[PDB]
Design a protein around this ligand. Structure first.
Ligand SMILES: CCCCCCCCCCCCC/C=C/[C@H](O)[C@H](N)CO
Ligand SMILES: CCCCCCCCCCCCC/C=C/[C@H](O)[C@H](N)CO
Ligand SMILES: CCCCCCCCCCCCCC(=O)O
Ligand SMILES: CCCCCCCCCCCCCC(=O)O
Lengths: 276, 64, 64, 238, 251, 57, 238, 276, 57, 60
């Protein structure tokens, strides 16, 4: 049979024998391998069912949003500055974070897509003729010189990779290799950061992947416009090791694994059933 | 009450009979009957009636 | 909080109970009778709140 | 230049495509791999592994370890019901939150048979017999042991081997069944009845515990990826 | 010649004015192979105890008649071990042999269309009103089309010129059919294989096809002729098998 | 240097063509066609083998 | 990069093209096919199948089963007309609503000959003879049997074989004829005349019925897809 | 001869024989195979006429609209919300529905096209500078988490397929495999939904293909704009089984096969004709 | 892996080229060139064969 | 995808070019040709044929 093709059921007959395929011991920590043709009479069906949609490349290989980066053209505060930043971490959304905490160690190549959607800010009037705005996305490695403000010559992208995008076109895409220093992306790091067992606890000390700085290249606009940059990670060529139990309780913090307690499942009213 | 259909469709070879032509309130499940203009003749295979559906839309009006 | 289950509608002797939307709160069911049978009671039932628990709005027809 | 023409579908971002894209760190030397033990190449490898099912959810027992404990005791009349739940391994409250529940809830279809492995966690001198039954969804819930002996069943005898595997087979008119349940692809009911009784020597407590594990066989298959209705959020995490 | 004899089970049927046998869409009924099957259980296959000529009740051909429709297998639900294997089993897969028979004379006239319509989904009489499950198909009595349109509140549409489904009634001749023309023909026989998109299905919530007979040219004779000509249907399952034995249904 | 492999079709013109353009390997397409699996690390992680017909104790 | 240049026709949505397009569920395992009986590979397979034609439309008889019933009775003078209609198998009121009418109305051209199969549905002791004639559209409608015997005709004798197939041939100056009729491609007239009479023994009713079926031969062909003027709508269905 | 090529007429002569190709019996349910050269004298013509435009791939293989999805940028009701939905069914238009109820069982691969046309809502004034709006079309499978509102993190497309589209470009296209769980798309399902012969009747219980959620990615607009999203299904690699009679009476409901009665055809005044 | 087949031309340079790009089979073009037909299931669905020249009864 | 770059001349309608363009009636069966007499394959075939010249135009 081909690869990824599930096994079929062989024929069976009415047995009366000293072989017990149904009796086992869970105390050995061994899951049973009972075919349905062991405990009853089955025919010979042929299963053409493939296990294609279960592999880690077919499972993780769908693009999921990880951040909503907001910036503007006229600074009103430091949450809506002329530029912005994003410390690179995949633990800020709730959908992709659960897919990556199903395995302990992963090793995946990435490809990043930005869906940047400007929208006009509310004001007294709105009538203006605006050229199509241009966005710059610079990736500062861990330790590089961050831009303290707009109109700063740290945005020169002398060695850091930077993408540019004039509005109306296709979204930008770039691919990223396996950027760790170990041999796998540790999703969980049960330990401290300093050697005297102190500092910060958990996977915060291992996530050192840099920053990601967004800005408008166009200098002015007659009436200001608030842009929204959404980042779409998608893993590929992925390996995964040591599967975890999937997380029950919903998240609280983007660096901790802090959680409230809840029940294991939804409660019914009685253990049995009643209908004739 | 209070959710009335709009006016029935302008068919080029049909018109509304009295008293359906003057009123503008049609509830759901109402019926309207069609006599036609003084140039046309009734086709016997069809039924010249339209109903309001649940979603405030008249039924499919084929030419009568 | 999740929705509250109404009591089970049971069975109409010589009739048909349509449950197309469960028996939770705000769910609507319907009744009808067999060939050559008379329906004494409402055609459709609804689950509304009565104080603290959920009950059906009307009992079941026989049928006759 | 070369004469081309753009088909419909250009300049779009399909969320589930595959395309080459220019690398941002060219000629980058990734770190060499090592042989870490415990590699997963397939999500069906995890779904073939047992996990104890919280059958005793009633009522408010989910906030303790009494959820997994199915209680058995010496009876006065044989043929009574131990437990019972519908066979909906992605939607039923017993089975949707286990290890076969959290992986199956990421999908929309599922095929193949399953297992239901038991474990008597009582005293070593006690003795019981049970009848675990899976009935296809035609005639409704089996009312007594006489109605449930007609379907699929397995008579489990409690001895030195302290486990018995009811392998719930695959009987369906459709090749796949939906995870979130529709009435076209309903799958059945799992019951368990006192075959004889529990008979104990003196100086042994009455209330015992049976642990129930669920797994998939080697013909399970899932399809049609979606997102799980278990982890929600309102705002971004900071 | 014009004589044929069918023998299924312990019962046989002989004809002497028989046109031909219309074997469905060119398919003789067979068993489920090992590569089309889905259910992993072992099926029970009763050869002689089920596959035999169960005769229904004979309906009367009035001069003002419209037509009648049966709905299978639910019209075979209280005949023999068919109606007992249908209760104790979730699935079920079978083909049929339908023998509609009507003799009058060489002084009567009339012509029936005898058709087997797969999945004749019927429209409501009064819309926005779900109709009853016994106004479509009772267990043994056939059903009857009306001569004009229906105004029932919880029934189907029984205007016979629209065939119930909403199509023109003369366009039914692509479904495997015959005719019972009292000038020449006497009995019509159709061998219908199992037609469904699934290998096996439930027997109670799904009527796999629908046998409609419709008088096109009406029954007219002399007033001194025989004023009662009956129409009997004699349907036999073929190659039946069932799967998933549980307790008796069908709720 | 072209590569021609098998498309994903159902089981009762069936090829495709892949040219890698960029010089790296992070710039490849997804590897959607690896269906190898070995679940005996998680189902049978035992030291002494246990035959399914013999008693485990 | 590679120098290209967009031709006219880029970024358009032609409603009747064919282009590859990236799948939204990649590596999806579709369900295996089974041998369902009754496969249609061509719309001309349905159009070669008979269907009874409602010739007796007059007047208001379409709301009953009297539409299909062509009546015949014992005559006083031979050579009278049984029925008659134009040969327009997509536009004439007799033939546009049958099984050869609903498939042909999806198209705009049609070629090839047709059939017109009859069936005497009278008493088994009665006896008749008929002359079914198809006349090409040159000289107009044939007025009597003497004018209609000159064209194509078939003398049908009513015996033990209770059917006769007039095969209306293909005589035209154009390779195709339009479905909705234009005067350049008019196709003819189909008549039927009493060849001798109906002669019956006593104690048999007078009014009989002849059923008329239409089909296509093995040289039919259709062309130039369009949308049918039979199913209309105003708003969306909910 | 080549495939799909209709047969030609052989030569014939004036016969006088015991062979009767014209006399047959319809009572056998057999359509006659009378060549025109059987009942008259014909020449030997050669027919080059191909049956290309009749096959199910050439017949069904034309894109037909199935829905008109309306949504806006400022919510006024729940029919013109900030987002919308569409329960996926091909029985809401009258043109494609009749082409699919000509066969009982079909098995076709699909390819979907969206023609999304914004249009400015009426107001007091209209003068504004607007960035090109971006649309998101998410496909929720049957059972997934639906977005209760805009600005909800169910729109994260963590695993569901989603397309994005900036206005001005070509329309989006994606292809869909045979998505059923049976072995064919049952257009007609003569049966009930529950086992006690109740519930809902017909093909409503078998149409479980999910939803399709549309929204504007751009957060604001100075003066609101009502968009109209039209969905264009087109079947391909199509098989078709058990042909039905084509439907006479026009439709009423999008889930029932409810209908009013009508005559079989259009009525004339007399059965014969009269002209010399 | 290229495929070269016959174009659709009339009957009294005639080729085309198809490269499948995507890895699936749902992402193919339309199969507009299958003209096989078998209408004897609907025209002749009988058990005993009936020759068109012999009488059917 | 494949890296391309548009030359000058894209998205134009040159009135005298030749380019393939997707057909609107695919798999259409055109009608078979017949041998009509008098085929012109060239406009110079007509220009080699005599024609009487109006030399006496004067006047009116
Ligand atoms: C021109 C812009 C290029 C942007 C380059 C950014 C590439 C860096 C992305 C790092 C990829 C790994 C992300 C981290 C995953 C972690 O291992 C786990 N989520 C642990 O939290
Ligand atoms: C990114 C958006 C992708 C959208 C994916 C939608 C694909 C689902 C479409 C289902 C295809 C079959 C449609 C149903 C046809 C039925 O069998 C018949 N019409 C019965 O009503
Ligand atoms: C990146 C190459 C762009 C050139 C245009 C595409 C054609 C490449 C395939 C044919 C030449 C390579 C043959 C093999 O290798
Ligand atoms: C998907 C391939 C894109 C490369 C450029 C198109 C050239 C492909 C045809 C030539 C190389 C393949 C030869 C065969 O196979």
């Amino acid at each position: 049979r081909a690869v990824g093709r599930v096994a079929d059921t062989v024929a069976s007959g009415p047995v009366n024998t000293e072989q017990i395929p149904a009796l086992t011991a869970v105390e050995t920590g061994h899951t049973s391998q009972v075919v349905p043709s062991d405990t009853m009479q089955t025919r010979h069906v042929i299963n053409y069912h493939t296990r294609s949609e279960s592999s880690i490349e077919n499972f993780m290989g769908r693009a999921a949003c990880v951040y909503i980066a907001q910036y503007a053209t006229e600074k009103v505060n430091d949450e809506l500055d002329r530029y912005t930043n994003w410390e690179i971490t995949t633990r800020q959304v709730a959908q992709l974070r659960r897919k990556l905490e199903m395995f302990t160690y992963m090793r995946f190549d990435l490809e990043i897509t930005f869906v940047i959607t400007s929208s006009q800010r509310t004001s007294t009037t709105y009538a203006s003729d605006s050229p199509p705005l241009t966005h710059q996305v610079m990736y500062v490695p861990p330790g590089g010189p961050i831009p303290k403000s707009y109109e700063d010559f740290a945005w020169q992208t002398s060695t850091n990779p930077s993408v540019f995008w004039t509005e109306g076109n296709a979204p930008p895409r770039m691919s990223i290799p396996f950027m760790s220093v170990g041999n796998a992306y540790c999703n969980f790091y049960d330990g401290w950061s300093h050697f005297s067992q102190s500092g910060v606890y958990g996977y915060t000390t291992l996530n050192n992947m840099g920053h990601l700085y967004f800005r408008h290249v166009n200098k002015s606009t007659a009436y200001p416009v608030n842009s929204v940059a959404r980042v779409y990670f998608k893993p590929k060529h992925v390996k995964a090791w040591v599967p975890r139990a999937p997380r029950l309780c919903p998240y609280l913090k983007a660096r901790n694994v802090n959680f409230n307690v809840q029940g294991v499942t939804e409660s019914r009213n009685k253990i049995t059933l009643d209908r004739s | 009450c209070n959710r009335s259909c709009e006016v029935p469709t302008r068919l080029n070879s049909a018109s509304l009979k009295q008293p359906y032509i003057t009123q503008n309130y049609f509830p759901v499940g109402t019926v309207v009957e069609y006599e036609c203009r003084p140039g046309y003749r009734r086709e016997p295979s069809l039924s010249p009636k339209l109903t309001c559906l649940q979603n405030l839309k008249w039924s499919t009006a084929v030419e009568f | 909080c999740k929705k509250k289950s109404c009591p089970n509608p049971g069975e109409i002797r010589n009739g048909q109970i349509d449950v197309p939307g469960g028996i939770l709160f705000g769910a609507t069911i319907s009744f009808s009778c067999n060939t050559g049978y008379k329906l004494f009671g409402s055609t459709s039932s609804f689950c509304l709140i009565s104080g603290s628990s959920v009950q059906w709005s009307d009992p079941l027809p026989e049928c006759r | 230049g070369l004469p081309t023409m753009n088909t419909p579908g250009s300049t779009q971002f399909l969320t589930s495509d595959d395309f080459q894209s220019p690398s941002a760190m060219p000629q980058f030397d990734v770190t060499p791999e090592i042989q870490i033990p415990g590699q997963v190449r397939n999500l069906m490898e995890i779904a073939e592994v047992d996990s104890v099912v919280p059958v005793n959810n009633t009522e408010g027992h989910v906030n303790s370890m009494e959820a997994y404990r199915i209680p058995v005791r010496p009876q006065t009349s044989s043929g009574e019901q131990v437990f019972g739940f519908q066979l909906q391994p992605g939607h039923d409250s017993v089975l949707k939150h286990t290890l076969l529940g959290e992986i199956l809830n990421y999908y929309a279809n599922w095929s193949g048979s399953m297992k239901l492995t038991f474990m008597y966690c009582g005293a070593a001198m006690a003795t019981g017999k049970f009848l675990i039954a899976y009935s296809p969804p035609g005639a409704g819930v089996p009312g007594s042991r006489r109605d449930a002996m007609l379907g699929t069943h397995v008579i489990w005898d409690v001895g030195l081997q302290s486990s018995c595997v009811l392998c719930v087979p695959w009987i369906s008119q459709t090749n796949y069944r939906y995870v979130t349940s529709d009435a076209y692809t309903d799958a059945g009911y799992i019951t368990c009845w006192y075959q004889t009784s529990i008979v104990t020597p003196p100086d042994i407590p009455t209330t015992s515990t049976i642990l129930c594990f669920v797994s998939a066989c080697n013909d399970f298959s899932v399809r049609l990826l979606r997102d799980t209705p278990f982890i929600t959020q309102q705002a971004l995490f900071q | 010649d014009r004589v044929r004899s069918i023998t299924l089970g312990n019962s046989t049927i002989t004809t002497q004015e028989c046109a031909n046998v219309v074997v469905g869409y060119g398919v003789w009924p067979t068993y489920l192979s090992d590569h089309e099957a889905t259910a992993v259980d072992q099926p029970t296959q009763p050869d002689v105890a089920t596959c035999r000529f169960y005769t229904l009740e004979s309906v009367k051909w009035e001069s003002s008649s419209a037509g009648w429709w049966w709905k299978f297998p639910e019209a075979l639900s209280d005949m023999g071990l068919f109606g007992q294997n249908m209760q104790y089993h979730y699935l079920g897969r079978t083909g049929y042999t339908i023998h509609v028979q009507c003799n009058a004379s060489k002084f009567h006239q009339g012509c029936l269309l005898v058709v087997c319509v797969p999945e004749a989904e019927m429209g409501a009489a009064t819309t926005d009103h779900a109709f009853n499950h016994t106004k479509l198909s009772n267990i043994g009595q056939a059903m009857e089309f009306s001569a004009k349109k229906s105004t029932d509140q919880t029934g189907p549409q029984t205007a016979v010129h629209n065939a119930g489904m909403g199509v023109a009634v003369g366009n039914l001749t692509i479904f495997p059919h015959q005719w019972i023309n009292l000038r020449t023909n006497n009995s019509a026989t159709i061998v219908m294989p199992y037609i469904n998109s699934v290998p096996m299905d439930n027997m109670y919530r799904h009527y796999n096809f629908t046998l409609m007979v419709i008088p096109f040219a009406k029954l007219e004779h002399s007033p001194q002729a025989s004023t009662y000509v009956p129409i009997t249907v004699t349907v036999a399952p073929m190659c039946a098998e069932y799967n998933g034995l549980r307790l008796a249904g069908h709720q | 240097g072209a590569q021609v492999s098998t498309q994903k079709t159902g089981a009762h013109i069936i090829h495709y063509t892949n040219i890698n353009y960029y010089k790296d390997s992070a710039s490849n397409s997804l590897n959607r066609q690896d269906f190898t699996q070995d679940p005996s690390k998680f189902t049978e992680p035992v030291k002494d083998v246990m035959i399914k017909t013999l008693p485990a104790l």
